[PDB]
Design a protein around this ligand. Structure first.
Ligand SMILES: Nc1ncnc2c1ncn2[C@@H]1O[C@H](COP(=O)(O)OP(=O)(O)OP(=O)(O)O)[C@@H](O)[C@H]1O
Ligand SMILES: [Mg+2]
Ligand SMILES: [Zn+2]
Lengths: 128, 60, 52, 115, 83, 155, 205, 98
RNA sequence: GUUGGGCACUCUAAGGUGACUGCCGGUGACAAACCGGAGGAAGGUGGGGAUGACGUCAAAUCAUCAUGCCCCUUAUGACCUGGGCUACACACGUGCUACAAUGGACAGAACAAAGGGCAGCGAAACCGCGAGGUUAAGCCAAUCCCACAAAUCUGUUCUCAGUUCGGAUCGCAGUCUGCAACUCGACUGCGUGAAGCUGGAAUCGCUAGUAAUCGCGGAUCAGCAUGCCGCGGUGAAUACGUUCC
RNA sequence: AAGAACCUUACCAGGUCUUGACAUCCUCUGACAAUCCUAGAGAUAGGACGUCCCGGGGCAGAGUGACAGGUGGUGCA
C-alpha cells in the first residue's frame, strides 16, 4: 500500500520508519511501543514530529530499529519520522526544521584518550 | 639481554611452562607482542621505517 | 557515630478526654539536631517528651 | 524465641532470624526451612510451637554455637601446635593467606600505632 | 587446592628416600629441597632437613602434620620485629 | 569564561505537566545519570501533594518555588585586609536555578524515609514557606541587606 | 623527544611500505626473515651505496629489489656478485630468492645515501661543518626544494657533546603531503658515536 | 559457484587486483557477483613511546585488513584456468574455494 | 530471515558531493575582520585524533639497543636447586568496595558497541548447589564461537538497624592451570561477619554526549588485574563575569 | 613491568664449570648426538645403543691461543 519511508539515526541506533495510513499506532519491531520503550518522556518526544504537524491519528508508524539503547532508539525513531513526513508533504518542512527535528543530533561517544581515564577525565593530580 | 639469557631462552627448558618469549631482535623479555615477536622498542623502530607490513600510525 | 533519623511523627494526635493537646502534627528529629520546644505553659511540651 | 540457646529476633522473617545462630547463614537457613517445610515469609513471633519444634530438631544435627566455636578453636590450636607457618602468622597477628603486609592488613594488625 | 583427581603431590626423589628408610626401619635425617612436597603418613616419625633458602632445617614430622607441605614448617624469612 | 557568555541549554517540557520547570527539577534530582529514578520520585511526590493538599500539585509547586527563589545574593570580594560580601541582583534564570537546587538539597536532608515523601513535605513547607529551603533564602536576603553598604563595590 | 620520524608519519598516506607482502598465520615468520635479509644486504653491500630494499613474497618465492646508486658494483662482472648474493640468500631463507637491482639516478637525493656518505666523512676526520655544508650544496643542485642536515655527539672530540644542524630552502615537516625523505646514520670515532640525521624535501604530492 | 576472497593491507591494490579478477571471469563468460566490500578489520596496538618510564606517553598504530568477496556464477572450464592464471601483485591474499 | 525470492531499506567500503564568511543585512576604513539571517546533516578552525618550532631543565635512560673510556677474566663471566623481588612498629601517592531506602534481596521483560579466536574459540546435550566436568556440533570466521551485556523498566519483599547495608579477616571443603599453588595464584561452596553512619587541616577532575554512573572487549598471558588501552549504555549541573589566586 | 609460584631474574644461600652458556677463527679427525639404566636437589657424571648429510657444499665433535664474555662503572663522555 501507500507508505512513506524515513531513516533516522541517534547515537548507535538506526531506525527505519515507514508511515502508513493508520490511527497513530507505533509498532517497533512488532511490539507496541509501550512494551519496547517504557519511558513516558521518551514516547512523548518520539511523537513530537506527529504533534507538530497535527498528524496524530493519520499514520501508523512501523519502525524497524536496531542498536544503541532505549533512549538512543527513541531519538532515532523520532528523526526517522520527521524525515518520513517530509516525503509525505513538503509543506511540513518549515515547521519541522524550525523545531529542529530534521537535524541529525551528531553527538557521539567521544573516544577514550591514553593517559586519561575517559574522554576528558584526567587522573587525580598531586604536586607532592 | 645477556647473550647467555638469549641462549637459555632459545634452548628448550626443563618444562614447557618455563618457555617464555623474548624479542628476537634485541632479546628484551618484557612487552613482547605475539603477532610480531618484537619488544615495544623494536616494534616502533621498524614501524617508522615501513618494514612492518600493513602497520601504520593510528588516529581516530 | 550513629544514624540520621531518630524521631519521626506522622499525623500525631494527643488528647486528654475531650481536650485535644495537638492534632495532625508531623515533625522529625535527626541526629545532632538541637531542638527547642517553645510554647506557653500547658501547651504540651512535657507531654510530647513522655510520649517520645 | 530461644533456639539452640539463642534468642532469635522474634520480629524478623524466619530465614533471617535463623542466621543469628552462630553457624547458620542465609543458604543454611533456607535448607532448614525447606527440610522442615516452614514458610520463609512468616514472622518468628507468629511461629507455632510445632514449627518451632521442627526447626529445633533439624538444627541439632548441625554444628552451631559452642560446638562450632570449639571446632574452629581446635583448628587454630592445631596449626600453632605443629609449628606451621600458618600457626606463626595466627599468633603474630599477620595475614595468613599471603596478603601483602607492607600496606593494609589493618584487620589483622588493628589500629595504626604511628611512630 | 591440588585437584583431587590428580591426588596429593610429593617429589618422588623424596618418596624414594623414605621408602628405603621404611623397608629397613631406619631413621636418618633426609636432606631435601622439595619444600613443595606433601607430608604423607609414610613420613611420620622421620626427620627431614628441608632447605629454607640458605640451610636445611630439621623438622620433626608428627602425625598431625600429614597433608601439609614440607616447606610449610621451614619459614624462609627472618624477622624479629622493628625497633 | 573570558571570551563571553556561552549558549545555555534547553530542556524539554515534562510529558505529564508540560512544564520546563518540572523537567529541570527532575534533572536536579537525578544521580549518576539515572533519570528514570528521578522522574518516578517527582511524579510520586506530586501525587502526595495533590493527595495531601487537594490542590493541583503544579500550583503548589509553583507557589513553593516563588517562596524559595532569591532576588538578591551576595558575592565575596577581597578588599585589602577584610573580605566584603557584595550584594548583587539575581538573574531570573539564576533565581530558578537556586530555587530548584536549594529545594532538592534540603529535601534530601529531611527525616522522612523515602525521597518522594521527603520532597513532598519540603514542597509543602515551602508552600507555607516554613521549611529549610525557605530559611536559606531568608539568610541570603539578610546577608545582602546587612552588607547593603557595599553594593557600590562590583567588578 | 619532540619530532616524530618524518617517514613514520607519512607511511600509508603518501609513502608506501618497503615490505609489500601480506601474511596471516606465517606473519611472524615472514617478518623476521625479512629482518635478517635486510641486515644481510646491508652488511654485504655496505660499500655499494644501498639505500632501499623492497621485499615481496609469493608462495615460496621472495622477490628482493635492491635500490642502489652503484648498480655496477652489486651486479659484478656478468652477474657474478648478484648470483653470489642469490646463493647466500637461498641458503639463509631456504627459499627461491630473485633479486632485481634498480639504479638510483640522483644519488644525492636519497636521504639514506646522504646520511651514510656524511657518516663516512665524519669517520675520516673531516670537519663536521665542511661535511654538512658541502653535502647540502650538492643536494640542492640536484633540485631538492630543501635539505636539513644534523650531526650530533662529541664534535671534534670535545668533552661536552652538542648538535650542529644546517638547512637550505624549505623543509615543511608538519605538511603531511610533503614527500620528505629522512634517514639516520652513525659514525664510529675514537670518542664514540656521532649521529647523522638528513631531511630532504623533494616537493609535494 | 566459485567463491573468491581477496585480502590486503592496501585497498588500492585490492581494488586493482579485484578488477583484474572480475574482468577475466567475465571475458570467459561466467557471471560475476560484483566484488562485495566486506567489513575491514582494524587491529590497534597502543605502545609506550619512551624507552624508560613516562607511562603516559603512548603511540598507537593500526593494521587495517581490507577484504573483498567475488563469487563467480555459471562457471566455464576456461574460466577456472583464467582465475589461476592471473598473477596478482605481492601483498594481496587470494583465496579460491570451489 | 527460516526456504523460495529479492537488495528495495539498513549495513558493509571504494570512488564522488558537501562548508567556502560562498550568499542576505548591519558594523568596520572602503581593509582585515566582527554581529545577526537564510538555506543545510552540519556555520564561522562542526566534534575528536595524528601532527609538538628555536631552545630550557648537565631532566630520564650505559638495564631495549648501540657505544668512548675505566674495571673483572679458575671471575664482576657460566650452570643448577631452593629462596628473595610478595618482609612489616610505620609514612605517602594512585585506585577498588562501601557506609545504604534514588537502597539490599528475589523474580519477569528487554536494549549495545567495539574487539578476539587454530592448538585457538569451543555450541548444544548431560552431570555438579557452584567454580567446573564428559562428549562434542560449528568456525582460519559480516557465516561458527567467546557472548547471558549491566545499569534501566516492571512487580514482590525488606522498613532505618552497624541491619536482609558492608564486605575484610579467618576456619573448612573443593575447581582449574601448571612438573609444582608452603613461602606465593585465580575462582567456587559452607561457615565466620571486621572497619565503616559521608570523612580535620587541606586538596583534585571536568565546559556536553563531557562529568557522573553501568557494563563489554583487548594487549601481556599455561594460570593470575581493582592496573593499562579501547567500546558502547544512561546522562546531567554550570560559565553572571575578570575584583581576587 | 602489555602479567615475579618454577621460568622470568639481573639479588641471596648452597652445590658446580673454565676458548667457556654465546661468536669468527685455526687446526685434527670423523657424526654430533638423540634415547634410555644407574647416581644426584639438579647442574652434572657414569654406562649403554647406534656412528656422518651432499675436493669439502657441509655438519659435527675433540685440542689449540687469538679470544669470548659482563643487566659491571660513568646518562656529568
Ligand atoms: N492526665 C491528664 N489529664 C488531663 N489533663 C492533663 C493530663 N496531663 C496533663 N494535662 C494537662 O495538659 C497539659 C499538658 O501539660 P504538660 O506538663 O504535659 O506540658 P507543658 O505545660 O507544655 O509543660 P511544662 O510543665 O514544661 O510547662 C497541661 O495543661 C496539663 O495540665
Ligand atoms: Mg512540663
Ligand atoms: Zn626488541
Amino acid at each position: 500500500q501507500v507508505q512513506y519511508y524515513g531513516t533516522g539515526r541517534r547515537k548507535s541506533s538506526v531506525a527505519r520508519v515507514r508511515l502508513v495510513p493508520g490511527e497513530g499506532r507505533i509498532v517497533v519491531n512488532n511490539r507496541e511501543i509501550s512494551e519496547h520503550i517504557p519511558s513516558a518522556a521518551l514516547i512523548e518526544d518520539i511523537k513530537q514530529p506527529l504533534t507538530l504537524t497535527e498528524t496524530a491519528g493519520t499514520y501508523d508508524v512501523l519502525v524497524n530499529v536496531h542498536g544503541g539503547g532505549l533512549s538512543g532508539q527513541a531519538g532515532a525513531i523520532r528523526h526517522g519520522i520527521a524525515r518520513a513526513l517530509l516525503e509525505a508533504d513538503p509543506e511540513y518542512r518549515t515547521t519541522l526544521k524550525r523545531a529542529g527535528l530534521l537535524t541529525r543530533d551528531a553527538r557521539m561517544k567521544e573516544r577514550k584518550k591514553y593517559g586519561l581515564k575517559g574522554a576528558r577525565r584526567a587522573p587525580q593530580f598531586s604536586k607532592r | 639481554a645477556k647473550k647467555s639469557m638469549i641462549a637459555k631462552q632459545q634452548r628448550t627448558p626443563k618444562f614447557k611452562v618455563q618457555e617464555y618469549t623474548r624479542c628476537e631482535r634485541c632479546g628484551r623479555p618484557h612487552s613482547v607482542i605475539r603477532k610480531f615477536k618484537l619488544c615495544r622498542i623494536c616494534f616502533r623502530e621498524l614501524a617508522y621505517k615501513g618494514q612492518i607490513p600493513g602497520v601504520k600510525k593510528a588516529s581516530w | 557515630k550513629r544514624g540520621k533519623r531518630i524521631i519521626e511523627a506522622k499525623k500525631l494526635t494527643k488528647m486528654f478526654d475531650d481536650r485535644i493537646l495537638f492534632q495532625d502534627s508531623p515533625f522529625y528529629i535527626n541526629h545532632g539536631d538541637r531542638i527547642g520546644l517553645l510554647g506557653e505553659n500547658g501547651c504540651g511540651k512535657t507531654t510530647l517528651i513522655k510520649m517520645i | 524465641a530461644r533456639i539452640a540457646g539463642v534468642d532469635i529476633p522474634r520480629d524478623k522473617r524466619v530465614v533471617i532470624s535463623l542466621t543469628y545462630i552462630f553457624g547458620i547463614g542465609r543458604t543454611t537457613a533456607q535448607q532448614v526451612l525447606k527440610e522442615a517445610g516452614v514458610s520463609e515469609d512468616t514472622r518468628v513471633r507468629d511461629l507455632t510451637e510445632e514449627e518451632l519444634g521442627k526447626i529445633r530438631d533439624i538444627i541439632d544435627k548441625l554444628k552451631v554455637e559452642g560446638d562450632l566455636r570449639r571446632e574452629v578453636s581446635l583448628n587454630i590450636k592445631r596449626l600453632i601446635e605443629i609449628g606451621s607457618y600458618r600457626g606463626i602468622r595466627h599468633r603474630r597477628g599477620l595475614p595468613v593467606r599471603g596478603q601483602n603486609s607492607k600496606n593494609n592488613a589493618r584487620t589483622r594488625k588493628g589500629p595504626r600505632r604511628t611512630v | 587446592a591440588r585437584s583431587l583427581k590428580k591426588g596429593p603431590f610429593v617429589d618422588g626423589h623424596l618418596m624414594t628416600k623414605i621408602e628405603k628408610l621404611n623397608e629397613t626401619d631406619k631413621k636418618q635425617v633426609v636432606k631435601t629441597w622439595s619444600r613443595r612436597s606433601t607430608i604423607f603418613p609414610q613420613f611420620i616419625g622421620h626427620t627431614i632437613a628441608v632447605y629454607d633458602g640458605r640451610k636445611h632445617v630439621p623438622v620433626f614430622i608428627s602425625e598431625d602434620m600429614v597433608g601439609h607441605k614440607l616447606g610449610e614448617f621451614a619459614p624462609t624469612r627472618t624477622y624479629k620485629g622493628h625497633a | 569564561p573570558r571570551k563571553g557568555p556561552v549558549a545555555k541549554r534547553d530542556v524539554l517540557p515534562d510529558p505529564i505537566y508540560n512544564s520546563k520547570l518540572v523537567s529541570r527539577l527532575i534533572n536536579k534530582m537525578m544521580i549518576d545519570g539515572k533519570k528514570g529514578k528521578s522522574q518516578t520520585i517527582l511524579y510520586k511526590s506530586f501525587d502526595i501533594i495533590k493527595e495531601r493538599t487537594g490542590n493541583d500539585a503544579m500550583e503548589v509547586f509553583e507557589q513553593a518555588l516563588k517562596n524559595i527563589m532569591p532576588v538578591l545574593e551576595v558575592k565575596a570580594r577581597r578588599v585589602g585586609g577584610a573580605n566584603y560580601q557584595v550584594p548583587v541582583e539575581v538573574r531570573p534564570e539564576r533565581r530558578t536555578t537556586l530555587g530548584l537546587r536549594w529545594l532538592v538539597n534540603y529535601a534530601r536532608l529531611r527525616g522522612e524515609k523515602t525521597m518522594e515523601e521527603r520532597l513532598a513535605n519540603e514542597i509543602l513547607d515551602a508552600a507555607n514557606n516554613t521549611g529549610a529551603a525557605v530559611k536559606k533564602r531568608e539568610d541570603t536576603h539578610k546577608m545582602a541587606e546587612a552588607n547593603k553598604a557595599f553594593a557600590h563595590y562590583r567588578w | 623527544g619532540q619530532k616524530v620520524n618524518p617517514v613514520g608519519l607519512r607511511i600509508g598516506v603518501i609513502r608506501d611500505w618497503e615490505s609489500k607482502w601480506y601474511a596471516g598465520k606465517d606473519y611472524a615468520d615472514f617478518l623476521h626473515e625479512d629482518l635478517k635479509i635486510r641486515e644481510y644486504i646491508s652488511k654485504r653491500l655496505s660499500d655499494a651505496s644501498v639505500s632501499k630494499v623492497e621485499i615481496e613474497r609469493a608462495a615460496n618465492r621472495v622477490n628482493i629489489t635492491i635500490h642502489t646508486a652503484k648498480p655496477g658494483m652489486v651486479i659484478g662482472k656478468g652477474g657474478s656478485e648478484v648470483e653470489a648474493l642469490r646463493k647466500a640468500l637461498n641458503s639463509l631463507t631456504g627459499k627461491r630468492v630473485h633479486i632485481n637491482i634498480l639504479e638510483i639516478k640522483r644519488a644525492d637525493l636519497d636521504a639514506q645515501l646522504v646520511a651514510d656518505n656524511i657518516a663516512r666523512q665524519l669517520e675520516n676526520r673531516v670537519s663536521f661543518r665542511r661535511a654538512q655544508k658541502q653535502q647540502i650544496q650538492r643536494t640542492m643542485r640536484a633540485g631538492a626544494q630543501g635539505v636539513k642536515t644534523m650531526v650530533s655527539g662529541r664534535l671534534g672530540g670535545a668533552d661536552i657533546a652538542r648538535s650542529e644542524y644546517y638547512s637550505e630552502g624549505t623543509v615543511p615537516l608538519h605538511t603531511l603531503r610533503a614527500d620528505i625523505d629522512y634517514a639516520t646514520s652513525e659514525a664510529d670515532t675514537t670518542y664514540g658515536k656521532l649521529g647523522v640525521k638528513v631531511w630532504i624535501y623533494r616537493g609535494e604530492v | 559457484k566459485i567463491r573468491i576472497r581477496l585480502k590486503a593491507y592496501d585497498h588500492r591494490i585490492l581494488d586493482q587486483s579485484a578488477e583484474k579478477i572480475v574482468e577475466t571471469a567475465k571475458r570467459s563468460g561466467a557471471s560475476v557477483s560484483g566484488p562485495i566490500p566486506l567489513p575491514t578489520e582494524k587491529s590497534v596496538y597502543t605502545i609506550l613511546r619512551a624507552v624508560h618510564k613516562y607511562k603516559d606517553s603512548r603511540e598507537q598504530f593500526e593494521m587495517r585488513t581490507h577484504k573483498r568477496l567475488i563469487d563467480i556464477v555459471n562457471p566455464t572450464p576456461q574460466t577456472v584456468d583464467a582465475l589461476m592464471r592471473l598473477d596478482l601483485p605481492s601483498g594481496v591474499d587470494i583465496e579460491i574455494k570451489l
